Amino acid sequence: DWVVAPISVPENGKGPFPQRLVQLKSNKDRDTKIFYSITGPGADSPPEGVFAVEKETGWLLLNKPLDREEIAKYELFGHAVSENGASVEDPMNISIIVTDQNDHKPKFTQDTFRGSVLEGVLPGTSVMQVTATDEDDAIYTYNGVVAYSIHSQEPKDPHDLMFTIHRSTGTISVISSGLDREKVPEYTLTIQATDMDGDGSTTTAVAVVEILD
Amino acid sequence: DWVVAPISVPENGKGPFPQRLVQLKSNKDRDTKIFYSITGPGADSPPEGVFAVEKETGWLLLNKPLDREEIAKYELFGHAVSENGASVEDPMNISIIVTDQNDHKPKFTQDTFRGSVLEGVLPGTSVMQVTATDEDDAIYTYNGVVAYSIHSQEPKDPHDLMFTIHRSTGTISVISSGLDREKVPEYTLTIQATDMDGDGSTTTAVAVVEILD
Ligand SMILES: [Ca+2]
Ligand SMILES: [Ca+2]
Ligand SMILES: [Ca+2]
Ligand SMILES: [Ca+2]
Ligand code: NI
Ligand code: NI
């Protein structure tokens, strides 16, 4: 028959391996005996032997769990060969698409972000913008989508939270009145980024805000 | 004379090291032979041995190049001890301030951004935002300030550049007529982010735009 629909595999699949993906078959196996094999990156080029084929049965096998962030798509070729050594098919393209899981934590682009704002700005004024990246996919899944939060502030004067953060952009803004350099010239905000848009894992950094006159 | 003003040191200084910063001195050295030492993160707590003090002469020394993106300020303490082993001064606070150099290039938050726009929108309409960050300081210097540009667009139908990008926000916008899914369902925009507000180094990424019905 000798076509294969593109194959979709979720990354970091649980064992046991190997695991069967599809059974290769050439209809000319009624004539004589056939040996199946595969080539391409993932098969006979680096990384070597992620995939294999059982030569007699024809089972395309995956031998180890995939990681989408190393490699997202594999293009292999299928080969059928008689016992006498004749290629009985044109080599068949086999496509394997690797689909995303949340195997990565978000990671702030810096351990500390600094900012400064004039003491007399109106509530609602932007101070600075923090950023956390995430290797997982952010286009078709939430695994790469960061939500931002302020865990805590020090000191807590005048009151508990002088600031807020935009949950998607990481822009930090003044939400209350009464910033005053003489009184409190600097704040330390413990910031957090949580992937799967708020429902996943969390990473922590700090933002240090300078109050200017 | 047991006082020291804040010392500023530009990061990634060239050798040779070690480098003299300031000479510590107790006035009580006219009565006894004095030994000088330093404590604090950077001195005897991690990262250890970044700074030392010459025991006899009193010279505070920097032993290696600093990196502001690791540590921006060190708080250390100076000590003065008589040859007989007694403490002759209250320990002295010594602040080191690390000032910025442009040792980082901008990095895109991902290698590929994706967005869409309806083929009917008027020119000037926002399509998508791309983001790059720069670990270098952007409050006191231009080393962390990113300017965004569009290098090239593919394909060039109807014409060379259907899109523009806002220089500072990374918002990509439609600037020209002729979008038409049937003729061109997708554009690949090669995008660039440049530090020193356009005069420094450039990183590149790619933004793909789906034109929608
Ligand atoms: Ca993730
Ligand atoms: Ca992933
Ligand atoms: Ca830079
Ligand atoms: Ca720097
Ligand atoms: Ni990884
Ligand atoms: Ni660095």
Curated annotation (Swiss-Prot), chains A, B:
Glycans are attached at N93. It is found in: Cell membrane. Residues 1-108, 109-213 form the Cadherin domain. Expressed in some normal epithelial tissues and in some carcinoma cell lines. It is linked to Hypotrichosis congenital with juvenile macular dystrophy: A disorder characterized by congenital hypotrichosis, early hair loss, and severe degenerative changes of the retinal macula that culminate in blindness during the second to third decade of life. Ectodermal dysplasia, ectrodactyly, and macular dystrophy syndrome: A form of ectodermal dysplasia, a heterogeneous group of disorders due to abnormal development of two or more ectodermal structures. It is an autosomal recessive condition characterized by features of ectodermal dysplasia such as sparse eyebrows and scalp hair, and selective tooth agenesis associated with macular dystrophy and ectrodactyly. Interacts with CDCP1 and CTNNB1. Cadherins are calcium-dependent cell adhesion proteins. They preferentially interact with themselves in a homophilic manner in connecting cells; cadherins may thus contribute to the sorting of heterogeneous cell types. Three calcium ions are usually bound at the interface of each cadherin domain and rigidify the connections, imparting a strong curvature to the full-length ectodomain. This is Cadherin-3. The gene is CDH3. The chain holds residues 108 to 320 of 829 of the full protein.
